[PDB]
Design a protein around this ligand. Structure first.
Ligand SMILES: *[B]([O])([O])[C]([C]C1=[C][C]=[C]C([C][C])=[C]1)[N]C(=O)[C]([C]C1=[C][C]=[C][C]=[C]1)[N]C(=O)C1=N[C]=[C]N=[C]1
Ligand SMILES: *[B]([O])([O])[C]([C]C1=[C][C]=[C]C([C][C])=[C]1)[N]C(=O)[C]([C]C1=[C][C]=[C][C]=[C]1)[N]C(=O)C1=N[C]=[C]N=[C]1
Ligand code: NA
Lengths: 241, 242, 240, 219, 199, 204, 236, 229
C-alpha cells in the first residue's frame, strides 16, 4: 500500500506541489481559450479541438458552458475533469439562489470551486483536476467580470487573459492591443480573432460567446458560424490592407 | 523470487504463485511435528512439544485445544496465529449451536474456518496465518472424522495426517498402520511410537509428548489422554525404539 | 511486451493495455496440475476432471473438484483449490439469494454472469488479487435445454457446446473441436467424448478412481455425481 | 375503488373503475388504475393513489432491469415477490392494495398483494372499497375455463356492481386482457352511466368581470 | 385459522383450514397454510399473514443454503431453531405462529412449537384462533401409537370441529403427510368434511 | 387542519389553444389577515405556471426547491421543460417527503412545446399526479370551486370566455370562504402572449 | 532488506522480522526475575537510573489484588498493556464477583497482542512482561512477549543480561517449591544479582520487589521496605 | 481499500493510465456506428476462437432501455459493468421524469462514471470505449464515450483494431441522406475491411435504432444483408 502510493498531496524540496505543476502542463496541451472584458459586455473565444468531418455537433457548444442566468465559462484541460467542475459550479449557483433568492455574485462562485480544487492539493491522496477555467459574468456589485482559475485552486480577475495552447504568446499579444476602459464588444471581438489567428482559421476551428445586458436581464449567446465568418473576413480584409 | 512479487498476498508472481502464502507455509515446516490418526472408533492426536527451557511448567504452550466439546485441534506453526485460529474455530462452533440448536458437524466447521484462513491469502492489508492445524471429532451419526487446513485455506479429510518438520517421515510410518480396523486404546500406543521415531534427539533438545483423543471410548467428547494411558504409551514408544 | 511502474504487481494497465496480474491468475489455474473437460449433448451436460489422491492417508471422498451449487446446478472448478472453494461458496450464496428475491431458481447463465462480474472487481481494484481458478457450471434450462458455462479470473464468461480448463486446456479444446465438427449427441456419446478427451490429452488409460464425472439430464435435471462403478461402466465400454 | 381479476381458459382479465376520491368529493372522474409492469404483466392499484402509483412504477422499472439482464420474459412470481418484500418492509404504511395479473412460461396467474406484504394466488379476486360488490358477482357466476367473451362479460359486471354500489367507486370500466400472445388494454370498455347532459347557459359577456390591473407579456 | 401437527412412526401429518380473513370478511376461502421449508420439512402458518409469509420465506432461504453447505437435508431441529430464532428476535414486531414439522434420517418424524420464540417438541400440537375450542377434544381423542391414517383422521376431525365453532376458521382442510419416501398432499373439501353435532 | 392555518385557493382551467391559472392573494394566520398581496402562482417557463395552495412556508419552500431542480434540469438538458415533465418533477419532490410531507397541493397550467396543446394537472400533498382535460382545484374552498367549475366550464373556450369563466368561478367560490380572498389574480397563457390580471374582488 | 518494513510481510525463511525487532526491545530493558513457591509468587527487578540525579524507573506495577506485573521494554506499551490487564480484571469482578483466573488473563493478553502482528500499518507490542498471581490453582508466574506467545513458568528472567539470572533459576529450581517467603525472595535476588556487573551489587535504591500469595495481596516493596530482604544476602 | 489515486499526471502533463486504457481499446475487436437519416446502426466483430463457443450465449450489442442501445471496443468484462450502470441510470431518469432518457443525457451520466475511475482511489480506468445510439425528440443519436470520461457525438465512426482505416473509409464512402437500409450495408462493409475470414451471421453482430426503439438484428436479418455482400 505505501509502495503503490503516488503521494499527490505533498511538498517537494523547493516548496513545490508537483502534481499541481504537472496538471498545468496538461492545460498547455489543451486548445487555446481567451477571455476579454469590455464596457458593454464580456466575451469568451476558444479553439475547437473536436474538428473532424464526421462529428455530429448535437450541442450548442464544445468548450462554452452556461452556469447561471448571469454567468458562463470555458475550459482548457481534461474535458471529463471540466465536466465535473462545471456541474459543481451549477450546483453552487443554485444553492446560493435557493438561500438568498438572488443570483451568486461572480467572484463568489469562482472562490467556491477554487476551494474544492485547493482541497485536492492539500488532502485525500487523489490527483488534482487537470482544468483551467475562464469565467464571464455580470453581478450587481462589480458588473461585467472576467475570472481565471488553474488546477491549484488559485484564481484572479482580468481585463483580458488566455489559457491553453500558446497561452503565453496570446497574453503578450493581448497586453499590446488591449485599451483599458476604451474597449467595446465590437473592438474586443476584432481583437479575439486577431489573437487566435496568430496562436493557432475556419469558423469550424473557432467558437465565440458573449455576455451582454439587454433590458435589465443578462444575455449569453454563442455566435453562429456565419457571424464568426463575417468577423474573420473583416480581419482578413484589414490584414491584406 | 525476490523481485517484489513476494511481498504481498494481493500479488501473483509471473509463474502464477502467491509467495506470501508459501513463506507462511515455511513457518509451519520449520516447527515441531504434530500427528493425527483416524481409526475404527475415533480420532487420536499426538504432538512433539519441544522443551525450550527447563524453567517452563509441564503443560506450558499446549499445542492441543478443545475447539468444541466434541472437537479437538492439533497445531504446528506460529503459536499466536494457531491460538487465534482456535478462537475463530471456537466461535464458529458456538455460532452453529446458537443458529441450529445442535453440535457443529466437523466437515462444516473445517469448511467455515478454512475460509477465514483463505481470506487472509488475498490482500496487502493482512498477512496469511503461519499455521497448519487438524480437527478431530466423533459421533454415532457422523462417525470418526479427521480434517487438516493449511496457510492457503485448503481443507481435506484424512485417515492419517502429519504436519511440521517430520511431516513426510511420519507419513511413511502412519502408512504402515491399518488404522481403519483399530481402536483408540490401540492407536494411542502407535501415535506415541511414531512421534518418538520422527523426533531428532541430536538436533533438537528434550521434548514432551501431548496426547488427546475423541471417540466412542470418550462418548464423543474431546479429552486429553489420561496420565495412566499416556505413561503406558510412552513406555511402549521408548521400548520399541530399542 | 513492456512494463512501466507497478503494472506487474497490481491490476493497473501496462503500456500495451494489458493486465499482467490477470494474466498471472490464468497461469495459477495450471499450478493445480489438473485438467477439466465439459461436453453438452442433445439432452444432457457432463463435466469430468482428474482425481489425484497420492497418499492412501487421505479420505478419498473429501478430495473433489466437482460441487453442487444448487439442486439442478453443478460445477467443476479448476485451479487453486482454496480459491476454488471460495468461489463455490459465493456461487451457492448468489444462487440461494436469487431464489429468495425473485422466487425462481437462478439460470446457469445468470449465475455465471454474476460470478464473472464479482471476478471483474478484483481485475479493477488494486488492493486484492484475482482468484487463481476457473469455474465451469452445468444445468438443464426449462426453455434452453442443457447449458455449459465457464468464467475466468479475467471476468470473461461464455456458453459452450464443449469446453476445457487447466494444464492441457489447449489440447483438450483442439480435440473437442475435432469431434464436434464430425454424431447423435446422446448421453453415452456426450459422456464418452469427455472421458476420452481427458485420456488422450493426458495419455493416461484411466482407472475408476482416477477421474470424477458429474452430469445433468433432461429426464433427471438434478446434478448427479457418478459412482466409481458408474465411471467403470463407461470406461469398460470405451475399451470394447 | 373497485379492482378485479379473473383467470380464464386462455389468460387473465383485469378490471378497474375510474374514480379518485378526496374525502367524499370526486376529484377525478377518469383515472387509470390498470398499470403496466411488463408486456404480459399488469397490476391494478387501490388505496392511497400515490402509493399505488409509485410502488407499481418501481416494480415495473425493476422488472425492466430484470428482463434486460436475464434476456427472458419476466415471471409473475418475481413481480409478486419484489412487491411483497417492499411492502412488508414498510409495515403497511405504503397503502397500496394490488391485483397482479399476467402470463409467463408457466401460464396465466392472478395474485392479490396487501399493504402489509401478504399475498394469495387466486383464480379470481377483488380489492378496494367496492371489492365486496365485485366479489359477489365473481362468486355468483365464476366457472373455471371461461371463454374470453364470457370472462370479459363477468369482469365488466363485477366492476359495474362496485361502480353503482360503492360511493368510493364510479366512472367507467377499464379492462386488460392478457394472453400468451400479449396484452390488449381495453380502456373505457364499459360506461355504466350514459353521457351526462345539462342545458348549460353559463356564458359571461366579455367585460362582466371587474378588472383592476392588466399587464400583457408578448412571447 | 386452525393448524395441527401429529408425530407417528415414519414421520408427521400436518393440517390446516383454508380461511384468510380481514375482520369479519373472508378474503381467501381456499388458502393452503402448509408451506414447505425443505423437501420433507414443512411449517403450518397462523397469525398475521404478512408476518407468517415473511418468516417462512426467510426460513426456507436460510435452510436451503444450510442444506447445500452440510451436503445433506437439514435436520427438523435445525429448521425449528431457524424459525424460532426469527420469531424470538422479532417477537415484539411479529404476530405470527409458525408450527414446524417434518422428517429426518436421525430423529425421524418430529413436531415442533415455535410460539413467541419458544421451542418445544410435541407428540401432537395445535395452533391458531380455532385451537382454543378443540383443546378438550384433542385431550380426549389423542392416543399414542396412531397410524398415519389414524393421524389424518385425528387431524381432520379436530380441524373440522374447530372450523365449525371458529368464525376465523373455515373452508377446506389441507392435509400433508411427510415420510422417508416423500410428501403426500390431501385436500378435504367443505362438502366432504366429517360431521358432528352442529346445533 | 394544517392546510386551513393559512387558507387560500388555486385553480387551473383548459382552453381551445390557451390555459388559465388563478389564485387568491390573502396571506393570513388563522382568523387574522397579514398581507393582501401574497404570491401563490410562480412562472416555471415562458408558457408554464405552477400554483400552490396550503401552508405558506411550504408553498414558498416547494416553489424554491422546485425552481432549484428546474434550473439545473434546463442547464443539463439545454431545453425548456415540457409541462408533463414538470408534473413528474413535482410528484417526485413531494413523494420524497411521503412520511412527513409539505402542506401544499399544487396545480400546474402550461402549453406543450408543440406551442399549442394545453396541459392542466394537480398533485396531492404526497405528490400524486392528476391530469384533467377541464379544470383542477386546490384550496380551503375546493367544494365551492368544484361547484363553480362544474357549472361554468365549457369545452373549447376562447381566451376571453376562459377569462370570464375562471374569474367568476374563483370570485364566487372564495366569497363563501372566510380564509380565502383579498383579491384574485388570473394568468391567461396563449402561444403568443401571457395576460396577467388582478380582479376587483371583495376585501373582507 | 525488503522483509524488514512491515509485520504483514513474511520473509522467504518463514520469519517475521518486525516481530523479532520488537523482541529486541525486551532484551534491552533491565533484568527482571519472577519465581514461585507452593504458596507465593515473587517478582524481583533491577531499576536503572538515567543519571545520578534521576530516579530509578518503576519496573513493577499493580494489576489487581491477586495479580502484579514486572515490565521490560517500551514503557508506553507496558502502560497500555497494564491498563488492559487492570480493566479485564475489573470487568471480571464487576460481572462475576470473583478474581479473574490468572491463566485466563494471560490468554487475553496473547489474543490482544496477536491482532497487530497480522494487520498492515500496525506493529507488535514492544513489551515483555513477567506476571505474578494467585488464584484457585495456587501461585503462578507467566511470561508474555512482543511475539503474542506466552508461557507458564516455574521461574523466569527477561531483559539485559537475563541469561545469567536464568542459569541460577535453573540450578536452584528444585528448592523453590518448599521455600519459605524470605528464602524464595532471596533466590530471586541472587538470580537478579547474577545479571549485575562484577563491580556492582544489589541496593535499597536499585532493587524492587513484588509479592502475592496465599494470605498476601499483591504488595510492592521499593526502598526501606526492601531492606529486610537484602539483609540476608551474603556473597559474590 | 486503497484511498489514493492510481491515475496521476506524468511530468509531461499526461494521465498515462488513461493513455494505457485507450491502448486496450485500440487492440479490441472492431465496432462501427452509423447515424442514418431515419435511424442508427451499431455493428461489431463477434468472431470467437473456435466452433466450441456457443455464439448465441453472450452479446456485444446490448439494449439499455427501449430506445437506447450499446456497443464497445476493448475489455469485455469492463463493458458489462457500464451496461448495468447505464441501464440503472436510464431507470432513475424514467422514474423521476416519466419520459425516455435523452441519449445525450444517458451518455453524459455514463461518461461521469468513467471519469470517476480516473480519479477515485485504488481503481484503474475502464479499458473500454462505448458507442451509444438512441432515438429521442424524433431524431437519431450516435455518441462515443472513452476511458477518460470524454464523450463525442458522431455522424459515423470506428473503434478497435484498424479504426484509423475504418474512420477514413466511412468519411469517403458515405454521407448524410442515408436510409437505415443503406447504413447497415455500409457498417458491414466497414467491418469487412478488417475481418480475417468468411463473414457469417454468427461472427458479426448488428443493432438498429429507429422510431420503433432499439433492437438487435436477428441472424436471419444479418444473413440477408450478407446475401448482398
Ligand atoms: B380508490 O378509490 O381506492 C383510488 C385509487 C386510485 C386513484 C387514482 C389513481 C390510481 C392509480 C393507481 C388509484 N384511491 C383514491 O381515490 C384515493 C383516496 C382513497 C383511499 C382509500 C380508499 C378510498 C379512496 N385518492 C387519492 O389518493 C387521490 N385522489 C385524487 C388525486 N390524487 C390522489
Ligand atoms: B389465520 O386466520 O391465522 C390466517 C393464517 C395465514 C398465515 C399466512 C398466510 C395467510 C394468507 C396470506 C394466512 N391469517 C389470517 O387470516 C389473517 C387474519 C387473522 C389472524 C389471526 C386470527 C384470525 C384472523 N389475515 C391477515 O392478516 C390478512 N389477510 C388478508 C388481508 N389483510 C390481512
Ligand atoms: Na486487483
Amino acid at each position: 500500500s505505501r509502495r503503490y502510493d503516488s503521494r499527490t498531496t505533498i511538498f517537494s524540496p523547493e516548496g513545490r506541489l508537483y502534481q499541481v505543476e504537472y496538471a498545468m502542463e496538461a492545460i498547455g496541451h489543451a486548445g487555446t481559450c481567451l477571455g476579454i472584458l469590455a464596457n458593454d459586455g464580456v466575451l469568451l473565444a476558444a479553439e475547437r479541438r473536436n474538428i473532424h468531418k464526421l462529428l455530429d455537433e448535437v450541442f450548442f457548444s464544445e468548450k462554452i458552458y452556461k452556469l447561471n442566468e448571469d454567468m458562463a465559462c470555458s475550459v482548457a484541460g481534461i474535458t471529463s475533469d471540466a465536466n465535473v467542475l462545471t456541474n459543481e459550479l451549477r450546483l453552487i449557483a443554485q444553492r446560493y439562489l435557493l438561500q438568498y433568492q438572488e443570483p451568486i455574485p461572480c467572484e463568489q462562485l469562482v472562490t467556491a470551486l477554487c476551494d474544492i480544487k485547493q482541497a485536492y492539493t492539500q488532502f485525500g491522496g487523489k490527483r488534482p483536476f487537470g482544468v483551467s477555467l475562464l469565467y464571464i459574468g455580470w453581478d450587481k456589485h462589480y458588473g461585467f467580470q472576467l475570472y481565471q482559475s488553474d488546477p491549484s485552486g488559485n484564481y484572479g480577475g482580468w481585463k483580458a487573459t488566455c489559457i491553453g495552447n500558446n497561452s503565453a504568446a496570446a497574453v503578450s499579444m493581448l497586453k499590446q492591443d488591449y485599451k483599458e476602459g476604451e474597449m467595446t464588444l465590437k473592438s474586443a471581438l476584432a481583437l479575439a480573432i486577431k489573437v487566435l489567428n496568430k496562436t493557432m482559421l475556419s469558423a469550424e476551428k473557432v467558437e465565440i460567446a458573449t455576455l451582454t445586458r439587454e433590458n435589465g436581464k443578462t444575455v449569453i449567446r454563442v455566435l453562429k458560424q456565419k457571424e464568426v465568418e463575417q468577423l474573420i473576413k473583416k480581419h482578413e480584409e484589414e490584414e491584406a490592407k | 523470487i525476490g523481485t517484489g512479487y513476494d511481498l504481498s498476498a494481493s500479488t501473483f508472481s509471473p509463474d502464477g504463485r502467491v509467495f506470501q502464502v508459501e513463506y507462511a507455509m515455511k513457518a509451519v515446516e520449520n516447527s515441531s511435528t504434530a500427528i493425527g490418526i483416524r481409526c475404527k472408533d475415533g480420532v487420536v492426536f499426538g504432538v512433539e512439544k519441544l522443551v525450550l527451557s527447563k524453567l517452563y511448567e509441564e503443560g506450558s504452550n499446549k499445542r492441543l485445544f478443545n475447539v468444541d466439546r466434541h472437537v479437538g485441534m492439533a497445531v504446528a506453526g506460529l503459536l499466536a496465529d494457531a491460538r487465534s485460529l482456535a478462537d475463530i474455530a471456537r466461535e464458529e462452533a458456538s455460532n452453529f449451536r446458537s443458529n441450529f440448536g445442535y453440535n457443529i458437524p466437523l466437515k462444516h466447521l473445517a469448511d467455515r474456518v478454512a475460509m477465514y484462513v483463505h481470506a487472509y491469502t488475498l490482500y496487502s492489508a493482512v498477512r496469511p496465518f503461519g499455521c497448519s492445524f487438524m480437527l478431530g471429532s466423533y459421533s454415532v451419526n457422523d462417525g470418526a472424522q479427521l480434517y487438516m487446513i493449511d496457510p492457503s485455506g485448503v481443507s481435506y479429510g484424512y485417515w492419517g495426517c502429519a504436519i511440521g518438520k517430520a511431516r513426510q517421515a511420519a507419513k511413511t510410518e502412519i502408512e504402515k498402520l491399518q488404522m481403519k480396523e483399530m481402536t483408540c486404546r490401540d492407536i494411542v500406543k502407535e501415535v506415541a511410537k511414531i512421534i518418538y521415531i520422527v523426533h531428532d534427539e541430536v538436533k533438537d533438545k528434550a521434548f514432551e509428548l501431548e496426547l488427546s483423543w475423541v471417540g466412542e471410548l470418550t462418548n464423543g467428547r474431546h479429552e486429553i489422554v489420561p496420565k495412566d494411558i499416556r505413561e503406558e504409551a510412552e513406555k511402549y514408544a521408548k521400548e520399541s525404539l530399542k | 511486451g513492456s512494463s512501466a511502474g507497478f503494472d506487474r504487481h497490481i491490476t493497473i494497465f501496462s503500456p500495451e493495455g494489458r493486465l499482467y496480474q490477470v494474466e498471472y491468475a490464468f497461469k495459477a489455474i495450471n499450478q493445480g496440475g489438473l485438467t477439466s473437460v465439459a461436453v453438452r449433448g442433445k439432452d444432457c451436460a457432463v463435466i469430468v476432471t482428474q482425481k489425484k489422491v497420492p497418499d492412501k492417508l487421505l479420505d478419498s471422498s473429501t478430495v473433489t473438484h466437482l460441487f453442487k451449487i444448487t439442486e439442478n446446478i453443478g460445477c467443476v472448478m479448476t485451479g487453486m483449490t482454496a480459491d476454488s472453494r471460495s468461489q463455490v461458496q459465493r456461487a451457492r450464496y448468489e444462487a440461494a439469494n436469487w431464489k429468495y428475491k425473485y422466487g425462481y431458481e437462478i439460470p446457469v447463465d445468470m449465475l455465471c454472469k454474476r460470478i464473472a462480474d464479482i471476478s471483474q472487481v478484483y481485475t479493477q481494484n488494486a488492493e486484492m488479487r484475482p482468484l487463481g481458478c476457473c469455474m465451469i457450471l452445468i444445468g438443464i434450462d426449462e426453455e434452453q435445454g442443457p447449458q455449459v458455462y465457464k468464467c475466468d479470473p479475467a471476468g470473461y464468461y461464455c456458453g459452450f457446446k464443449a469446453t476445457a480448463a487447466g494444464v492441457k486446456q489447449t489440447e483438450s479444446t483442439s480435440f473437442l473441436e475435432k469431434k464436434v465438427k464430425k454424431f447423435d449427441w446422446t448421453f453415452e456419446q456426450t459422456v464418452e467424448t469427455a472421458i476420452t478427451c481427458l485420456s488422450t490429452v493426458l495419455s493416461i488409460d484411466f482407472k475408476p478412481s482416477e477421474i470424477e464425472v458429474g452430469v445433468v439430464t433432461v429426464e433427471n435435471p438434478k446434478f448427479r455425481i457418478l459412482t466409481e462403478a458408474e465411471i467403470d461402466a463407461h470406461l469398460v465400454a470405451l475399451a470394447e | 375503488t373497485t379492482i378485479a381479476g379473473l383467470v380464464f381458459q386462455d389468460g387473465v382479465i383485469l378490471g378497474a373503475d375510474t374514480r379518485a376520491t378526496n374525502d367524499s368529493v370526486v376529484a377525478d372522474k377518469s383515472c387509470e388504475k390498470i398499470h403496466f409492469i411488463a408486456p404480459k404483466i399488469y397490476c391494478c392499484g387501490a388505496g392511497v393513489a400515490a402509493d399505488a402509483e409509485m410502488t407499481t412504477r418501481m416494480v415495473a422499472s425493476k422488472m425492466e432491469l430484470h428482463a434486460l439482464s436475464t434476456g427472458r420474459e419476466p415471471r409473475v412470481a418475481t413481480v409478486t415477490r419484489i412487491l411483497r418484500q417492499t411492502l412488508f418492509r414498510y409495515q403497511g404504511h405504503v397503502g397500496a392494495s394490488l391485483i397482479v395479473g399476467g402470463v409467463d412460461l408457466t401460464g396465466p396467474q392472478l395474485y392479490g398483494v396487501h399493504p402489509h406484504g401478504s399475498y394469495s394466488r387466486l383464480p379470481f379476486t377483488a380489492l378496494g372499497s367496492g371489492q365486496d360488490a365485485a366479489l359477489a358477482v365473481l362468486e355468483d357466476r365464476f366457472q373455471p375455463n371461461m371463454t374470453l367473451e364470457a370472462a370479459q362479460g363477468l369482469l365488466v359486471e363485477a366492476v359495474t356492481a362496485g361502480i353503482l354500489g360503492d360511493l368510493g367507486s364510479g366512472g367507467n370500466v377499464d379492462a386488460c386482457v392478457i394472453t400468451k400472445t400479449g396484452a390488449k388494454l381495453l380502456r373505457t370498455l364499459s360506461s355504466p352511466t350514459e353521457p351526462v347532459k345539462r342545458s348549460g347557459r353559463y356564458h359571461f359577456v366579455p367585460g362582466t368581470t371587474a378588472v383592476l390591473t392588466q399587464t400583457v407579456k408578448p412571447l | 385459522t386452525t393448524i395441527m401437527a401429529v408425530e407417528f412412526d415414519g414421520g408427521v401429518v400436518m393440517g390446516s383450514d383454508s380461511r384468510v380473513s380481514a375482520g369479519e370478511a373472508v378474503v381467501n376461502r381456499v388458502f393452503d397454510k402448509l408451506s414447505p421449508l425443505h423437501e420433507r420439512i414443512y411449517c403450518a402458518l397462523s397469525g398475521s399473514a404478512a408476518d407468517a409469509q415473511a418468516v417462512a420465506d426467510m426460513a426456507a432461504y436460510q435452510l436451503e443454503l444450510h442444506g447445500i453447505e452440510l451436503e445433506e437435508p437439514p435436520l427438523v431441529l435445525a429448521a425449528a431453531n431457524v424459525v424460532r430464532n426469527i420469531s424470538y428476535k422479532y417477537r415484539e414486531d411479529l404476530s405470527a405462529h409458525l408450527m414446524v414439522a417434518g422428517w429426518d434420517q436421525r430423529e425421524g418424524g418430529q413436531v415442533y412449537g415455535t410460539l413467541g420464540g419458544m421451542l418445544t417438541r410435541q407428540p401432537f400440537a395445535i395452533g391458531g384462533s380455532g385451537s382454543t375450542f378443540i383443546y378438550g377434544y384433542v385431550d380426549a381423542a389423542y392416543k399414542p401409537g396412531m397410524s398415519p391414517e389414524e393421524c389424518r383422521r385425528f387431524t381432520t376431525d379436530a380441524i373440522a370441529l374447530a372450523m365449525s365453532r371458529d368464525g376465523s376458521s373455515g373452508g377446506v382442510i389441507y392435509l400433508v403427510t411427510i415420510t422417508a419416501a416423500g410428501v403426500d398432499h390431501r385436500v378435504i373439501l367443505g362438502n366432504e368434511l366429517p360431521k358432528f353435532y352442529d346445533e | 387542519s394544517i392546510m386551513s392555518y393559512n387558507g387560500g385557493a388555486v385553480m387551473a382551467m383548459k382552453g381551445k389553444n390557451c390555459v388559465a391559472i388563478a389564485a387568491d392573494r390573502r396571506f393570513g394566520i388563522q382568523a387574522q389577515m397579514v398581507t393582501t398581496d401574497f404570491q401563490k402562482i410562480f412562472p416555471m417557463g415562458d408558457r408554464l405556471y405552477i400554483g400552490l395552495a396550503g401552508l405558506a412556508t411550504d408553498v414558498q419552500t416547494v416553489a424554491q426547491r422546485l425552481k432549484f431542480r428546474l434550473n439545473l434540469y434546463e442547464l443539463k438538458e439545454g431545453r425548456q421543460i415540457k409541462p408533463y415533465t414538470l408534473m413528474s418533477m413535482v410528484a417526485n419532490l413531494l413523494y420524497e417527503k411521503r412520511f412527513g410531507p409539505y402542506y401544499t397541493e399544487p396545480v400546474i397550467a402550461g402549453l406543450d412545446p408543440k406551442t399549442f396543446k394545453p396541459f392542466i394537472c394537480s398533485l396531492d400533498l404526497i405528490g400524486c399526479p392528476m391530469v384533467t382535460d377541464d379544470f383542477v382545484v386546490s384550496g380551503t374552498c375546493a367544494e365551492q370551486m368544484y361547484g363553480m367549475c362544474e357549472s361554468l366550464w365549457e369545452p373549447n373556450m376562447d381566451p376571453d370566455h376562459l377569462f370570464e369563466t375562471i374569474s367568476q368561478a374563483m370570485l364566487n367560490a372564495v366569497d363563501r370562504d372566510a380564509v380565502s380572498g383579498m383579491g384574485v389574480i388570473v394568468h391567461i397563457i396563449e402561444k403568443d402572449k401571457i395576460t396577467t390580471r388582478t380582479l376587483k374582488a371583495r376585501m373582507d | 532488506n525488503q522483509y524488514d518494513n512491515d509485520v504483514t510481510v513474511w520473509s522467504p525463511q518463514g520469519r517475521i522480522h518486525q516481530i523479532e525487532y520488537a523482541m529486541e526491545a525486551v532484551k534491552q530493558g533491565s533484568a527482571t526475575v519472577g519465581l514461585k513457591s507452593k504458596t507465593h509468587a515473587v517478582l524481583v527487578a533491577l531499576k536503572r537510573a538515567q543519571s545520578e540525579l534521576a530516579a530509578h524507573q518503576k519496573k513493577i506495577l499493580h494489576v489487581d489484588n491477586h495479580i502484579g506485573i514486572s515490565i521490560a521494554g517500551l514503557t508506553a506499551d507496558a502502560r497500555l498493556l497494564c491498563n488492559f490487564m487492570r480493566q479485564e480484571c475489573l470487568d471480571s469482578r464487576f460481572v462475576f464477583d470473583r478474581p479473574l483466573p490468572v491463566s485466563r488473563l494471560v490468554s487475553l493478553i496473547g489474543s490482544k497482542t496477536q491482532i497487530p502482528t497480522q494487520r498492515y500499518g500496525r506493529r507488535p507490542y514492544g513489551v515483555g512482561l513477567l506476571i505474578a498471581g494467585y488464584d484457585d490453582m495456587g501461585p503462578h508466574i507467566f511470561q508474555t512477549c512482543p511475539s503474542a506467545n506466552y508461557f507458564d513458568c516455574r521461574a523466569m528472567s527477561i531483559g539485559a543480561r537475563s541469561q545469567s539470572a536464568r542459569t541460577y533459576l535453573e540450578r536452584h529450581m528444585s528448592e523453590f517449591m518448599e521455600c519459605n517467603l524470605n528464602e524464595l525472595v532471596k533466590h530471586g535476588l541472587r538470580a537478579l544479582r547474577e545479571t549485575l556487573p562484577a563491580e556492582q551489587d544489589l541496593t535499597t535504591k536499585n532493587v524492587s520487589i513484588g509479592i502475592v500469595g496465599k494470605d498476601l495481596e499483591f504488595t510492592i516493596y521499593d526502598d526501606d521496605d526492601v531492606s529486610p530482604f537484602l539483609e540476608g544476602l551474603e556473597e559474590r | 481499500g486503497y484511498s489514493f489515486s492510481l491515475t496521476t499526471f506524468s511530468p509531461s502533463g499526461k494521465l498515462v493510465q488513461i493513455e494505457y486504457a485507450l491502448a486496450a481499446v485500440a487492440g479490441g475487436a472492431p465496432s462501427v456506428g452509423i447515424k442514418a437519416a431515419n435511424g442508427v446502426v451499431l455493428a461489431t466483430e463477434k468472431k470467437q476462437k473456435s466452433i466450441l463457443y456457443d455464439e448465441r450465449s453472450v452479446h456485444k450489442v446490448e439494449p439499455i432501455t427501449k430506445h437506447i442501445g450499446l456497443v464497445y471496443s476493448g475489455m469485455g468484462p469492463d463493458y458489462r459493468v457500464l451496461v448495468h450502470r447505464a441501464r440503472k441510470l436510464a431507470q432513475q431518469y424514467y422514474l423521476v421524469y416519466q419520459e425516455p432518457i435523452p441519449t445525450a443525457q444517458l451518455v453524459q451520466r455514463v461518461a461521469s462514471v468513467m471519469q470517476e475511475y480516473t480519479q477515485s482511489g485504488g481503481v484503474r480506468p475502464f479499458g473500454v470505449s462505448l458507442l451509444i445510439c438512441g432515438w429521442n425528440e424524433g431524431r437519431p443519436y450516435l455518441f462515443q464515450s472513452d476511458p477518460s470520461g470524454a464523450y463525442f457525438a458522431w455522424k459515423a465512426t470506428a473503434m478497435g483494431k484498424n479504426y484509423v482505416n475504418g474512420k477514413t473509409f466511412l468519411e469517403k464512402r458515405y454521407n448524410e441522406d442515408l436510409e437505415l437500409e443503406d447504413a447497415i450495408h455500409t457498417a458491414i462493409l466497414t467491418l469487412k475491411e478488417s475481418f480475417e475470414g468468411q463473414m457469417t451471421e454468427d461472427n458479426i453482430e448488428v443493432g438498429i435504432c429507429n422510431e420503433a426503439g432499439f433492437r438487435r438484428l436477428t441472424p436471419t436479418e444479418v444473413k440477408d444483408y450478407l446475401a448482398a455482400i
